[PDB]
Ligand SMILES: COC[C@H]1CC[C@@H]2/C1=C\[C@]1(C)C(=C(C(C)C)[C@@H]3CCO[C@@H]31)[C@@H](O[C@H]1O[C@@H]3COC(C)(C)O[C@H]3[C@H](O)[C@H]1O)[C@H](O)[C@@H]2C
Ligand SMILES: COC[C@H]1CC[C@@H]2/C1=C\[C@]1(C)C(=C(C(C)C)[C@@H]3CCO[C@@H]31)[C@@H](O[C@H]1O[C@@H]3COC(C)(C)O[C@H]3[C@H](O)[C@H]1O)[C@H](O)[C@@H]2C
């Protein structure tokens with residue numbers, strides 16, 4: 137693509153630089169370029185990929201929620217008619233967001249997922265697939281909302297099934313996947329109970345496996361366990 | 373241009389939305405679109421324009437300094453040869469930065485400046501012209517460095533001359549222009565003394581005129597006076 | 609106060 | 615500690 141002429145290692149090197157420079161769009165473009173080299177991603181590389189896009193889409197999502205909240209406010213009784221602009225700009229942001237999601241989903245589908253045979257890669261990618269469908273779900277309001285949601289669900293579930301089978305309960309990816317899946321339950325699938333049960337169970341099973349971990353791995357897991365806890369605290 | 377089909381007021385409305393959404397690139401694109409409507413900018417609009425681009429270029433500048441510092445580090449004795457990537461990516465960021473600067477300079481030149489007859493608009497625009505040439509100067513390393521610097525200087529000077537003639541010492545634009553011009557002296561023109569004298573004199577003359585201000589105007593001026601003070605404190 | 613995801 | 619500009 138755009139990055140077809142750059143060396144894979146250069147793209148990775150530049151993804152790391154863009155990250156240091158907080159240039160996440162660049163980062164994501166370099167990583168997409170790297171993915172498009174056709175070689176599987178190492179752990180660090182998938183991490184770069186995830187981070188790049190998570191940041192990109194995280195900015196679009198945040199912007200989308202700003203605009204969406206503005207838009208809903210302009211749809212309140214007594215709100216002055218402001219014209220199409222808010223909806224238009226929300227749509228513009230939303231379209232670009234969806235385009236990022238589609239891009240990521242497209243990378244996962246061509247061909248990260250099919251080539252991801254280790255649980256750590258496969259679960260990582262499915263988690264990401266769940267995430268990006270969830271971000272699509274966040275803005276989805278049409279007749280595909282259900283399908284988008286269940287694509288998120290299905291990718292999360294497959295990732296949960298493998299991670300449960302193949303990863304220790306404390307695995308950061310397992311924990312992160314559960315955290316997100318639980319958030320999906322909570323705010324996408326309108327299943328706060330499942331969200332809470334998932335976050336609780338995940339947290340508790342991680343707790344019980346902390347003992348097997350070195351100090352470095354301990355610190356990785358508890359970091360995500362804390363996010364589970366933050367959500368449990370928020371939600372209960 | 374890109375925004376040729378949108379209503380000027382819609383572009384402004386969307387610039388404000390993008391600002392709320394911290395979508396500064398969008399903001400800047402909407403404002404450029406608004407500028408390109410050919411009508412002069414109101415005060416609020418010039419403020420939107422300045423803010424949009426200041427933010428855009430502020431992110432590129434910050435990224436550029438990250439990459440530049442990386443690059444200089446990779447040029448230290450004993451630094452492992454990492455390939456062209458750091459320089460390339462710095463160049464890429466730098467090019468994009470220069471393209472923003474050029475874009476802004478281009479808007480100022482077509483045709484914000486020539487149509488800006490009130491001191492507040494004219495000084496504002498010249499300040500911006502000084503700023504964008506200064507941002508060019510920041511990355512300039514070639515044979516145009518001097519010309520870029522003196523274009524910054526010249527735009528700042530003209531803005532200082534008008535502002536001095538036509539604006540109260542406490543005018544936020546006057547203060548902001550002095551602040552930036554003093555920073556130009558300090559770090560672009562290698563004239564720390566002039567930078568300090570300018571910041572001091574500006575601060576002191578603003579101080580002596582605070583009394584004429586309402587509480588709202590007082591708060592605007594002192595805010596920038598504080599930035600002058602911060603620089604004086606840093607530099608002395 | 610925004611739920612966490614990772 | 616970075617000089618200010620506005
Ligand atoms: C597909 O979904 C990916 C999520 C699921 C949970 C989390 C994943 C994300 C990243 C790559 C990592 C985590 C944390 C917990 C370190 C961050 C959380 C959000 O993004 C990163 C993964 O961690 C890795 O990447 C980090 C990069 O950033 C630094 C800080 C340099 O530190 C690095 C860590 O040492 C490394 O273990 C963490 O193992 C897993 C993969
Ligand atoms: C061409 O260079 C422009 C600088 C020179 C000094 C500063 C200018 C910038 C803006 C528009 C304004 C200032 C501050 C001091 C308020 C910010 C500083 C950097 O960008 C903005 C101008 O202020 C205006 O815009 C603000 C927008 O943001 C809010 C916070 C809503 O508050 C608004 C203020 O009430 C309004 O007075 C300030 O008057 C002048 C024009």
Ligand SMILES: [Cl-]
Nearest residue numbers: 224225228386
């Ligand atoms: Cl729009």
Ligand SMILES: [Cl-]
Nearest residue numbers: 150460461464
């Ligand atoms: Cl590059």
Ligand SMILES: [Mg+2]
Nearest residue numbers: 165168235239
């Ligand atoms: Mg793309």
Ligand SMILES: [Mg+2]
Nearest residue numbers: 176251252253
């Ligand atoms: Mg494989």
Ligand SMILES: [Mg+2]
Nearest residue numbers: 255302303304
């Ligand atoms: Mg295993």
Ligand SMILES: [Mg+2]
Nearest residue numbers: 401404471475
């Ligand atoms: Mg442009």
Ligand SMILES: [Mg+2]
Nearest residue numbers: 412487488489
């Ligand atoms: Mg005029």
Ligand SMILES: [Mg+2]
Nearest residue numbers: 491538539540
């Ligand atoms: Mg006057």
